[PDB]
């Protein structure tokens, strides 16, 4: 049981890493930059996740 | 308005061990019943702490400032009244002044032409009065960068209790050009020891200052050579960057901590993110 619950927590905390981007919340970066320049940042997050 | 003063019992520093003191909330956001691990400036556990007295005896030298400092002072009648902070303290560089008037503390970020031996002169008078006509702190205030007045708290300024009930703590982080104050007070019935046990340190205020400080000294009430001041003591600890495991409680108070660099056992505690380790 510990090993399986160990994976999820390691999986969940990965949702709070810049992965090289300028933030770690999509709603943040979506409401903080225009359309044309957000894709380059969002790309780094997707490949990371 | 400057009068020199050397009516001191010249003594070398005394030392003590800072067991589990100097834990303050790192950030404003809230968490509960979780073990967050963070690294920041703190006071490392179990470190030598400089000791000075105050009553005859008069400890008020000038001590350096760097990467913050943890000032704590047991007190009866809380003779301490203020601090100074600055690089030159001669109306040359911006200087910081925190005068805690019985009425309220006013923050004066103004260049100040201080005295060589400044102190709050509150007149030794022994007729149930302490009338103050000795404003022996500075001489000139050409310009003021900032000004503020706090809540008008009137704290007790008398008493000779057998056990020093009052125990006030502070800490002064000066980073990113913002000044920070975290404080807590607790009645204590022990007599001497820097108390053993644990506590927290809530914030009170943060200031935008943008000034360079490397030196500081406390200020307190007091004639010059002659006074009736009760027993008072204050310890000074120098901060250092470290890493901690902070165990919040369901209430939301920081209940306990573990250092990440003290000894190998504590380092394994830091790695496993647990307060206990099986064999």
């Amino acid at each position: 049981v510990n090993q399986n619950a160990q994976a999820l927590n390691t999986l969940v905390k990965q949702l709070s890493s810049n992965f090289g981007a300028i933030s770690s919340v999509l709603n943040d970066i979506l409401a903080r930059l225009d359309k044309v320049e957000a894709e380059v940042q969002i790309d780094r997050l997707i490949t990371g996740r | 308005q400057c009068v020199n003063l050397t009516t001191r019992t010249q003594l070398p520093p005394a030392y003590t061990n800072s067991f589990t003191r100097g834990v303050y909330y790192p950030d404003k956001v809230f968490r509960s019943s979780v073990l967050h691990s963070t690294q920041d400036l703190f006071l490392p556990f179990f470190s030598n702490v400089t000791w000075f007295h105050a009553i005859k005896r008069f400890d008020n030298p000038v001590l350096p400032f760097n990467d913050g400092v943890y000032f704590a002072s047991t007190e009866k009648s809380n003779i301490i009244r203020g601090w100074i902070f600055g690089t030159t303290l001669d109306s040359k560089t911006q200087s910081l002044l925190i005068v805690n008037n019985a009425t309220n503390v006013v923050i004066k970020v103004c260049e100040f032409q201080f005295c060589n031996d400044p102190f709050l002169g509150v007149y030794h008078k022994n007729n149930k009065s302490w009338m103050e006509s000795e404003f022996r702190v500075y001489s000139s205030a050409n310009n003021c960068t900032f000004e503020y007045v706090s809540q008008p708290f009137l704290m007790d300024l008398e008493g000779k209790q057998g056990n020093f009930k009052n125990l006030r703590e502070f800490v002064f982080k000066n980073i990113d050009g913002y000044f920070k104050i975290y404080s807590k007070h607790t009645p204590i019935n022990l007599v001497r020891d820097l108390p053993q046990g644990f506590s927290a340190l809530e914030p009170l205020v943060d200031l935008p200052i943008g000034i360079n400080i490397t030196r500081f000294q406390t200020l307190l009430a007091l004639s010059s050579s002659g006074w009736t001041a009760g027993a008072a003591a204050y310890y000074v600890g120098y901060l250092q960057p470290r890493t901690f495991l902070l165990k919040y409680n369901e209430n939301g108070t920081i209940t306990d901590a573990v250092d990440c660099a003290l000894d190998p056992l504590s380092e394994t505690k830091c790695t496993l993110k647990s307060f206990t380790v099986e064999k």
Partner: protein
Amino acid sequence: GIYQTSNFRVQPTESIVRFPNITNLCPFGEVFNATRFASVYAWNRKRISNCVADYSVLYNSASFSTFKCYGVSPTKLNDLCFTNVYADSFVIRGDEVRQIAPGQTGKIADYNYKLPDDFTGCVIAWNSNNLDSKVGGNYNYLYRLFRKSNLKPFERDISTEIYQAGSTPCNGVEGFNCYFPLQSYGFQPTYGVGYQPYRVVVLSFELLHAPATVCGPKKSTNLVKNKCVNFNFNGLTGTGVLTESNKKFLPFQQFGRDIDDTTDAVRDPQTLEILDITPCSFGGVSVITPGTNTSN
């Protein structure tokens, strides 16, 4: 058999835009129209707080020449509340207007003003030949021509020490390989583009550490409960249902992450109520069917 398809979700219903209470306008205009602008070495510093700033007037106006925002988009710059705002004001020659960029190289960009790589603010420049050029030369402005060690971002250097170009000791007011740290700008109307003076202002800012105070259009609506809505409490957009919680915040607490990273129960502006957040119900629909050959 049974097959798993096209997970469903609850749709949201309405919006919530509860911002803090409206105060006055920010006095940036008099900053961007000051009698005099400080020189580059001792660039003037101004702090912005306790005001409401509408960026439409600043942006839509043709009153500026070159405009560029780095960490934000100026289009929706009027919908994020800032903890603080810095108004840094100085005048330089138009030649080095590219040195303002973070991570740039140049005498101004190395010696007397530096920026971090992650400078989140916006930078504005505006030509100022007509008033800042003097028919005899606007030599009021100097600059740190030489510095012993290039300064870190946002540290002003004010010393007038005579430069040491060599290891030989520098002596007197002037000496061997000794030079004044400052050299005066010449600004006359005869100058062409790049040579004429410029009024340049930069507006950095900082995020979320304390409850912000500068905002734009407020349009707070209500605190509807138990409704799938779009909440925008201060610039933290999110969805879910807002409930009352027996949770307690100390007088300096919002933004309860409360497990790992999720903006769980949070207080509100306009008032003081410790709310709670839970995302709307979710699940994955699945279809159980017999063979289509048999029945449908």
